[PDB]
Every structure is written in C-alpha cells, then in structure tokens.
Symmetry: D2
Subunit: 423 residues, 4 copies
C-alpha cells in the first residue's frame, strides 16, 4: 500500500534511494563512465537487458537515474531519459518515433532552437516537421498525414507564451494514433503536467526552470507510458535488430518509448547528461515548486506592472486579463502560465534595446528559467535563426523583450524594469 | 616555435581568465553568459562576434578542452560532445543528411557500428561497412552519396590499424573526408590528421579523459578538407544562419564551425563543462598515461602472447601481428593499450579469466587508467549479429584488455593468476 | 546612489559579478589552487596586501568570495570568510579573537560539536569556554572575566531550540567590550540577522539551511564590522608580526576581524572551503528565503501537529503557544523560529527509537537544514559526546527526537510522523 | 603479495560501491548518511560500528583518498583535511596542546612557518625552529614539552633534505613522533614512514593532487609510533568520547583515529568530497607525473646549473649540492621537482626572469602539472622576517621553480629565453 507523496515531497525524494554502500543522503555524483560487472554472465545479462543495472553512463547513470525518475514522478510518467540538453531531449523525443521520411506536426510557436532543429536539422535527416499555428486546432488536423509521427508543442510558446489547447491537440494526435509531445520547459511539472492533459511524451530543457540555477544544460524526455504504440511506430512494436529482436512494447510494456529512447538514441547518439549536471539539476528540482511558485508570483506581478506601465505598448502574459490564452492559462496553468512573458515597450525595437541595455538586475543572457531574472530580445537572439515569417509565426516581434522572471524580490525586478523604462 | 605535445596537453587552449587569473580551468558550470548590450547579443547570435552565448553551443571550460584536443591533433578546432557516440554522430551528421552514405570500416566499436547500421540508417544515412584490410573495399563501397570514410585508429576490439594514408587518398580522390575515430590512440599515439584524416573523433570518455569518470566526445576538424559540392551545407548558404556559408565565414574551420552551429546547437549533444574539466584533468597527463598504457600493454601483450594458456593475442605490436607494419608506420609509440587475447579453452576459459581477475576491472570502457577487461562478444559488441561481430573482429573467446597504468607486475600477476586457474 | 536590493535579490545576486572573461552568468567553480600573478611586483603586492586579488584558494577563492559576500550581504555584515565547516567557522570565529589563556562565554545550549569544540578542543588550546544557561542573562554577566573574548550563542539551541535574548546578551557582551558571536545556523539570515540584534560576528554551518541540500559541509564567519576592537583583542589592534606589522583595524577598518580571520586563521590553519562546496552552497543560498519560508511553514505545521498529538508528551518549538521562547521567537524570529524542533513521544526513549525507526520520509541522519526532513535522537547522536549534565544543559533529553523539518509536502511529513507515532 | 605503487595509486582504498558498481569513485557530495536504526546511529556515534556519520568526520570519497595515501605511504590510515595547512595544524594539534612544543626545521613552507610561529603560538604551542642541517639542533631544541619533530621532506623552498632517519632517532629517543611534510616528494619519491616518520602530512594541493585544482591536506599515520605519556590524549580516556582511549580502541591507528574524531570533527578542516575526487584523479597518475616532474626538474636544474646567467641552482640532485648524498639516500628517484636558482643580477634579474617566462606560470603553488615560478622572498615566505626567510633558505634573488610535466624542451626554452633577456 505505497504512499502517494505530494509534489514537494517528490521533487525532493522521488527516484532517490539511499545507496546501500555509503547511505549518503545526497545523491552521489556518480561521475563514472563505467560500472563493474560482477561476472561475465552479469555483463552479458546487462547488455542483453536480462538484468537491470549500470552498464555505462552514456546509457544510464545512477545520479541521472534519480533525476529521470524524479521528473517522471513529477510529470506522472513511467520513465524519463535525461539528455545533454533540451535540444537533445527534443531530438530524441522525435527521433525515437520518427525516421527519415516521417513527419511531425509542431506548433510554429517554438523556441528558435527547436524550430531550427525541426526546420533544418531534422529536415536534413528526412524528418519533415510541418509547422502549424497552434491557435488553430484545425491546422494540427490539416497538417497530419499518414507520415506524421507526433504533434509537438511547447506548453508556453518560447516566446509567444501561447498555451496550446493540450487536450484538444492531444485528441487530434490520439485520433490519428500519434503521440502528443509537449515541451514543458516553460512550466515544469509544478505548473503543468502535460501527461494529465493528453501529452504522451513530455520533454524539457532542464536547463531552464527544472534546473533553475542557470548552471547546467540538460534535457529530459518523459514518457507518459500512456500511448499505445501502433503500426505508425514500427520500431516500438517490431523486433529491434540492434537488440536481437527485442520488441520495446513487449519487453518494456508502457515504458516502450522511453526504454527505446535510452537503448537506441541515448546509447547510439549519446546525447547523455553528465551525472554532475544531473546532480545540479536535482538540486534545482529539490526546490522546483518553491522556485516555480516564486517565479510565477513574480512573473504575475511584473507582467501586471508592465501591463499598466505607460512606456509599455503590450505585455504578452496569459495571466493578464484579455490575453488570448487567459482561459487556457486558467484551464491548464492555473498556478500561473510560467514566469516567462514578453512585452513591447513604446518606442519599439529602439526602446527594447534601451530597456535591455539599462536593466541592472535582469541578466541580459540567452536562457530562461534561471532563478535570476533574465531579459533578451528574442528577434535578434533566441529566434535570430528564424526567417522574419518563422519569427512572426513563433510570436516573435521586433519590439519584443522576453523576460524570464526570476525569484528576486519583485520590488527589485519592478524597480529594475521601471528604471530601464524611464530611460 | 611550437610547444611539445606534453606542454600542449597541459596548456593548449588554456588561457588565464582575466577576471580571477585562475591557473586551473574554471568549471564554467553555466548555461548562459551576459550580453553587455543588445547589439552584442545580436552580434553574437549573428556570428558577427566571438563570445559565449550558451553552453549548449559553447562553453569556456569546454573550449579549453576543444582547443587542447585540436592542438594535440593539429586540428583547426574541435567541438566537444556529450559522448564519443555524439562526436561520431555529429562528425557524420555534419556532412551527411538523409540519402547519404558513409563508408566505414566494419572494425568498429559496437556502439559506432550500431549507430551507423541502425540509428543513422533511420536518419536515411546508409553506412556501408567495408573490410578495412582491403583498400579496394573502401573504393568499392564509395558511391556519389558517400560523404565520408570512417575508421577507428585501432578497431574496437579488432585492434586493426587501417592504412590511414591509403584510405585518406581514397576518400580524398572521391572528394570526401576521412574521419578517424582516434579514441584508442589519442593524439599522443596517433595524430590521424598527419596521416590523411580530415576529421578526428574521440570518445574522450576513454584514454583522453583517462580516468573513467566522464563520458565525452570530441570532433576535431583538421581544417584541411576542401569542402566541395558533396557537402552543400558547408559551401552553400545555410538558411538557419541567414545564408551564412561555412567555408566563406570560417574558412578552414567550416566543418567544425558548422558542427557547432548546426548539430551541437540543434541536437545539443553538448558536454558538461564539468566533464570538460575532468577530461582536461585527464588530458593534462595524456602522454604520461598513454606512454604507460602502451608500455604496459606491450608487456602484457608479450606476456600473454608467450603464455601456454593463451591461444592468441591480438596486438599490432606483437611480432607476426597482421598490423605490425601498420603499427610501425602509424603508431610507432605503440598501437594503443587495448588488445585482445583468446585463452585456450575458448569462451568458457574467457569467462573463467574475466571472473578470476581481481585487479582488472570487468566493466564496459577502455582507456581508463585502470586495467579493464571484458568479453566484447557478450558486451561491447553484443548488439552486433555474429556476422557483424566477426566483421568487427569480435571472437567468442576474445577477451579485450584495456591495459591500465597499474604496475605491470600486478597486471601480469592478475592475468597470470587468472590464466593459471584455467585447466590445460 | 547604489540600489538597496531585497533579501530575495541578494540571496541570488549578492557578491556575484559577471566575470570579465566569459560573462558566465552562473558563478564559475574556480576549482583552482592558484592564480596567475601578472608580475613579480603584483605577486609581491598581493602577498603584501597592497593589492586585492587572488593569491591562493586556501586564502581566498572567487567562487567562495561570492558566497562570502552573499552571506555577508544577507546578514548585513562587512565581510565573511567561508570555512570548510560550521565547526571551522566557529573555531575560527573564536580563535580569531581568543588565544591560549583566553575565555569565551558560551550558551550551554550548543550543538554537541560546538560544545565539544568549546569544552575540549579549545580547552586543549588554552581557551576556556565558560558555559552559561542562556535563559539567565545574569549567567553571561557572571561568567565574563577579564579574559573573556566573546559570548557565543546559537540563534536556536541545537537542539534546545532556545532563543537567547540576543540584544540583552549583546548588551552584556558590549558592556564588557567583547563581541557577541551568534551561530545563526538554525535560522539563516532569512529568519534572523543577528547583526541587527547585537551580534558582532555571525557564524553558520552553511552545511545546514544555508546550503540547504545536505550536499556540502561549509561554514562561514560573518563580521558585522560593528565591533570596536579594543585592548581585549590586541591582535586586531596591534601590529601583526606575520604581516610586517599590519594592524587589522588600521588596514581593514571595520573589516579588521574578518580580514584577520582570513589572513591569519584561514591562511594558517587552512579550514578553507572548496570552491565546489561554495558553488553548491551558493545554489542553496539562491533559494534560501524560499526554502527557509517553506521550512518554517512546515516546521510550524508539523510542530502544531505534534503539539496536539496524543502520542507526543511535548514539542519544543518556540512558535508553539506556551513555549518559554515564544516571545523571543516573536521578537527575534518572527518569520518562524527555524524549522528544527524537538518532541518527546509518550513512551520516552523507547517510543523515540520506534518513531525514528518507523519514519519512512524523514531521513534518520546527522544533519539539519536539509531540504529533506531529518530526524535523529540527539542524546545518542548529535550530543552523544556530551556528559549527561552537558546534554541536560544543552536541552538534550533521552526521549527527545529532533526534527529538521524539510520542504516536503507538510501532509507527507505529518503522515510520516503520524504513521511512525501510531507504531 | 602487495600491489605496486602504480597499482595502489589507482586502486588503493577504492572499492566498487555495492549500490551502483561505479568504477569511478563517486563524489559523495553529501553532508550526511542515513542511519538504518536509532541503534545504528547510536553505535556509529558511540564508535561501536564503522560507517558514515557526517562528511565533516568522514566521507566515502575522501575515505578512498585517505586510504590511498595511507597505502602509498604505508601508513595505517590518513585523514584528509581542507588544506595542507590544516593537515599540519591537525598533525600537531592532535598531539600538542597549549603549553606544548614542537621542534620544526626552520626550512619550512612560509605558511607552515607562520602557522608554527604565530597561529600555534597563540594556541600555546611553541614551535622551536631548528637548523635541520644539524641533528644536534633537533636534540638541543627538544624539551619535556616537545610533542613532535616536524620537517619537510624538501624544504619549501630551501630544498634541503633533512636526515630523516637520524632525526627520527632523535624524536623517538625523546618518545615523540617525527612528522614529515612530504608534500614536495609524495610517496612516489619518498615514503617518510620508511625512514622514521611516524606521521606524514601533505599538502595534497601540490603534487599529490597534481593539477592545481584542489586545496587539500592529509595526515598519514604510520601507525608505528607508540603513544606514551607525552601524548596523554592518545593513551588516556577522552572525556569527549566517554573515556575512549585511542590506543585501546584503535591500536596502531590511535593517532589518526583521534585526529579524525577530535580535530577533524571539532575544528572541521574537512576536505570536500569533490576535492577528494579531484585529488584522487591526480593521485591516479602520481607516479607518472612525479617521474616526469623529477625527470624534468633534473634536466631543468642541470640546464640552469650550467647556465652562464644563473649564479646558483639549488637542487639536491645537482653535483655538489649539500643535500646530494641525502637525495641519493632518501629521494633516489629525484629530490622532488621543485628547486630554486638565483640568476646573476640577483633579485632584479629574478624579477626580469619571472616577468619574462611565458610557459612557467607565475603563481603561488607547487606541484602542479604546470611549471610554476615564483620569488619566494616576496610571496610564499613574504610573511617571514629576513631572519626567518634566511633560516628557511629563502634568498632575495631566489626563484623557485616547480617543474611541471611540460616538454622539458619548452621549459628549458622558456627559462633560457627569459634568462637570455637578462643582460650579463
Ligand atoms: Na550594457
Ligand atoms: Na566475479
Ligand atoms: Na530502520
Ligand atoms: Na608579466
């Protein structure tokens, strides 16, 4: 009769077992490549997948395992695989179910890096990502073909801060027998558990809020385990010749996708996470709810402040009255639609430049989801790779300042942004 | 006036940071870097200015290691990756897209083989495995889709030494780069770029890192390969960078620039700055470790080669080894520190030995300071078919030793004691 | 006209400057022993203290410097020196102003380790620590002699959870021209800034709440800079022969004590903190307010829960109605008297053993101030070194369970402790 | 059947953790460790049971390093500390209380000298500095309060080699331990315990760690010293442990047990598990690095010893060096890799050289892989009076080189180029 722990317990404990050797309370940093095999048979068994155990950190690492289990536990997934980066998580999440010739439907409202991965890198690997305006559920529907393997959206458009109608998009995905992949980087499980809202697979840049401290690039893929792998995902339901005819759904049941992702993509492409990074991201995850609550409390107040400020044209934050995504925010992200939002100063690009140049507390850097408040001009930075049209479709605007509202004293954030605005 | 290898392994790429004057390479365990101005942020993203943008793309700790490996290999630049697998993936994906082919030696690390045969196959990249013993096979396998020839310096675990220069001439004849996975040699024992490689990849996990702590890969660009129409993504405007042409913007660093700006940035198989730091600590002693590794490997290989309980020992430096002359030509300091042997009594004896060694670590790795042992057929190359294993030089009785820097007398004793427990 | 940032901003930003080299937003881990000297003159200048700069990590490290400045900024001190441990902080805090033949007055209500340091280790170095019942201000007064160099108390007795009357004890210390040293480990600057309440010197086990994640042993000494070093502290006001007649108060002004502590004790005894530890403790400090707020919110609810529980004899938490320290809690620790408190089950030692043995979420380990909830029986563990009398005086009791209430879901903590109590 | 040094430096103290089977030593960056039961917690605190209690007291990563250094030195045990200074402090404070004396060579690292002369003096410990050249001075300085003789293996920066065995006989005659700070040699070059040391201390910061990353110290207990009435705290009930007698509970490990249980626990100059991890990575290559260090040092010392712009070179392995025979006797592999030289043109030339070297790192450290240079009189020993500096063998013109593992040709070139810039 196992205990159902709360989020705040899970973010601290989940996936974390006291190692039998040292009884270390902290998750050891298993900064190891390798692990002893007690016997040839055990080694053969580990590689044959006949026995669970550590083989090689590229495949699996006991530090990272904590983080994987922890995020899976927070999202309510069966499993997760940490990656070297959000981008690697996204890459893996797609490549796990999409091969050359396959298609993915993605919101156009993506982080520039995902957009580029989708538009360019995956394109070159024969994966055609069809970008849809996520505001138009029919566009998901229209873009799906026999070749579509997934719908991919961000919980909160980097940096459109649009909230896809997850359950509606999930319905579309599931109607077509394809998984719904939600990049939940902007929300974290604390603000949004996409699995509860139809996501089959959640990915994160753990770089951002999950890690929370701007220290560690990291990604993770969380498998809901909810998705029935069908004939559109032959590699999940057919003998994998690289594992002597292992069938992921047969061997791993509902964990097929995440098992495959580890056994195929993590192992083969090796976008593995450093155990050190895992450890640092774990230290972030330990305070995730606390951070995220402060982040969203601050984001609300900063967004409300900017929303009423006479030198600000607009503020794009779902929680602001009259935001297009307000009701989606209330439905899906009731704790607050993340802590990243955009605003357009009066004076446009030139005012934006001046603001970004005159904030002293906001950190002008390429990141979101640091405990520290971050500012950037997506058009020239995060989404610089996108064509004007792709930027436009990603919700990028020339005057747009993106704020990742940190957990600083809101009064300081307001003061900082106010002082910058008054210059 | 160039610094010697031993100096470079300690110093190359490592600058005293202007802030702290740290002698050690700081662990810049950061995601992000301040942009002084919106103009600077724009310039950085527009590649108008060098600087730190985001650790997925580049990191000053990792930069040291990249520059250092690039310096040791005599490459223009390098990009570190989360793993050797990612380095290999990136090395290929940088220049191969769906529809493309790569010619690879069959004598690969199982994981590379599997990446090539399966994962890349799913990305529309057909790796054609050739028998690297036969230069004609490289030539034969090349098509107008081939984008590279890929070999390991010393096949994991065949310990074959491709005829690098001859293979390089084939690649180059075909206007394709020769990629050498130099994991087993490190630049100390072999600098593939001096022998026709255009691109070197390492699992820095192995000897470069040397301590079994850190998964890491790197791709080193020789800078020598003239990217041609077979690599449009290097010589044609990149729509992801507003029609940047890598060869135009980066000259000889086109490949490695692209690899960072496209694959590292997009797929994000980035190395942890901490891993970079640890690998650096390995690299600092690379020549010392590798010299000891090879001194030990030779002794152990000689010991086992003479041993009444050992059927065979496969190490190029052993008299009569097929690859002996290639070892003399290409790895004169010693053909790495990994070799295989087959005990008399075959697989069963192999298991007894692996079970009986106390000092050798039974684990999946090579190129630890620690002596490692494994049975590749059931582990490292377990994913391969019998045929693939055979083509990879994996044999059922085969024990792979990664000869560490322990006291050779202990390693000999350990293996001797284990052997001397297997009945005649 | 520099900005007065809030606590939450400071815990994130204070002491942290973007390095000119890399512009890293995260505090680099300057895991270096050494630092380049541009010139013999610069090296000579650094060692002669004619120039600030990095010399050697044992003395100073730019990662640790952030943490030092940050804690100094949170406490409102002029400076801090991080140490390898709380114990080293305490050792240094004392040895910086007390030599063989000198005395210190300390509350008997100490962490066993401090008690032992005081009672034994310092005794052997000719420093006689006179232990007073801190409930009796007259006892501080009585125990002070010509030889007394300091009064030392914990903000919240480990594990008595007594609150000394800081300002009253400060008055006694200052009346005798000796500094008041407050071990603020249990509170952190978030709950209590001893410098605002008469402490001249604050020490912490940063191991505990400041670090917050149970990863890193670390201590720090924070100098208020408020204390006028007088003839009782010759080494602060007279030429230091180890620095060619440097006078700390002359060279360092109000930072004399902390400067000396670095230049003499840190340098000479070298209880220095790893830059890595500094980095990890910084990651804790970044969420300090958030953690501490959750900790105290949980501690209150758990203490209130245990305080009403029919299998609990007593709960010692200042914030519980009728606790002796309630008004001291309201005066000094209004945000909550830390998140560590003790309770005596009914059934005494035997029930305590059973509880400690049957908690599944509480971690039975020697630490406090982890994000994770911790449990231990001080009498047999943290204070095991103390004689029955010293334990008694430290507020240790045979039936006493000490809880470090973590930031888990209070419902889980309650459930855990309730389930343990019902066994 | 003992493992060789090279094996021990890689393996000693390192066990495969039962949980993960990590080959690498995990970084147990933990404060705390679960007690399975209140009984277990009680037993651990009551020292009825070995196990992990709290990282200030003991840590499984650090344990590896402690055991490893203890293994390399042939000690019973070791306790790592935050620094060499803390190791020295602990080594002394473990056996000296206020009122006690220590006899130390004057030829000390400035920081030790200063700890001894000032910090310990404030704790009522009178360190009597003797001229280690003259065995009689050790004898003369000993009083019934002396608790130890303390010397460095190779004086920082006098590079004098005490006559360890002769000094050990003096200490032992007086029933006091001989503590050798073996920082400059490491167990690879000198195992003081084999030459009469009872306690060895290191700055692991230096050669043991070898990479300039991590401040660390260790105290190694030979286990050989029979604690007597001059050490009541080792042979009398410890009131802090309910009358535990260290010699009774820990036998030959009394000292090192006490040091952990009293000084480490109470003063908490504990090493970061991360530092332990990094130092371990150094130690893994200790023999390799130290061999290269000494090979390089000899070459550099010979180069400078023959150099027309160098007045003197102080390195025991140089023909005519006062300590040559002691080098032959005690450090036959080479008297460490730190030496001094005085350029012709004295201090001014010294500054020119220090300013002019490009490869040598001007910084305060020794025993980095990197070659280091400094002017001790103005840096490392700056805190000492002229007299103390002189008694420490510090000279105004003196340049201390910590000869790294760079290519000797680069180091020679670097110093040659710098010298050849100083006018005759
Ligand atoms: Na600016
Ligand atoms: Na076995
Ligand atoms: Na139990
Ligand atoms: Na200079």
């Amino acid at each position: 009769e196992e205990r159902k722990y709360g989020f705040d317990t899970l973010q601290l404990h989940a996936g974390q077992f006291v190692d039998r050797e040292t009884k270390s309370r902290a998750v050891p940093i298993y900064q190891t490549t390798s692990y002893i095999f007690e016997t040839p048979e055990e080694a053969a068994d580990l590689f044959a997948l006949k026995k669970a155990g550590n083989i090689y950190t590229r495949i699996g690492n006991p530090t990272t395992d904590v983080l994987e289990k922890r995020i899976a536990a927070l999202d309510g997934g069966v499993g997760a695989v940490a990656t070297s980066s959000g981008q690697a998580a996204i890459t893996y999440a797609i490549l796990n179910i999409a091969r050359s010739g396959d298609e993915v439907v993605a919101a156009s409202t993506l982080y520039g890096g995902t957009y580029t991965l989708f538009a360019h890198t995956l394109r070159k690997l024969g994966i055609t990502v069809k970008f849809v305006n996520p505001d138009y559920l029919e566009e998901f529907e229209k873009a799906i073909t026999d070749k579509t393997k997934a719908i991919f959206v961000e919980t909160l458009g980097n940096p459109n801060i649009n909230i896809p109608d997850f359950e509606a998009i999930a319905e579309i995905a599931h109607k077509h027998g394809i998984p719904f992949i939600v990049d939940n980087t902007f929300a974290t499980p604390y603000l949004f558990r996409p699995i509860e809202h139809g996501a089959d697979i959640v990915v994160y840049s753990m770089t951002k809020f999950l890690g929370g401290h701007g220290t560690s690039i990291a990604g993770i893929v969380v498998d809901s385990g909810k998705f029935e792998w069908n004939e559109k995902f032959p590699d999940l339901i057919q003998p994998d010749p690289s594992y002597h005819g292992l069938i992921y759904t047969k061997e791993f049941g509902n964990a097929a996708y995440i098992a495959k992702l580890r056994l195929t993509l993590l192992r083969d492409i090796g976008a593995c996470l450093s155990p050190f990074n895992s450890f640092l991201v774990l230290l972030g995850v330990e305070t995730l709810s606390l951070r995220m609550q402060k982040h969203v409390d601050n984001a609300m107040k900063l967004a409300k402040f900017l929303n009423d400020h006479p030198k600000v044209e607009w503020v794009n934050y779902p929680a602001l009255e009259g935001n297009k995504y307000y009701e989606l925010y209330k439905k899906y992200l009731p704790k607050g639609p993340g802590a990243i939002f955009t605003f357009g100063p009066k004076g446009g690009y030139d005012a934006a430049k001046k603001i970004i140049n005159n904030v002293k507390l906001f950190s002008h850097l390429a990141n979101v989801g640091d405990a520290k408040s971050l500012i950037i001009h997506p058009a020239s930075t995060t989404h610089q790779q996108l064509t004007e049209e792709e930027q436009r479709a990603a919700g990028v605007l020339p005057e747009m300042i993106r704020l990742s509202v940190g957990i600083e004293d809101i009064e300081d954030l307001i003061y900082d942004i106010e002082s910058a605005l008054n210059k």
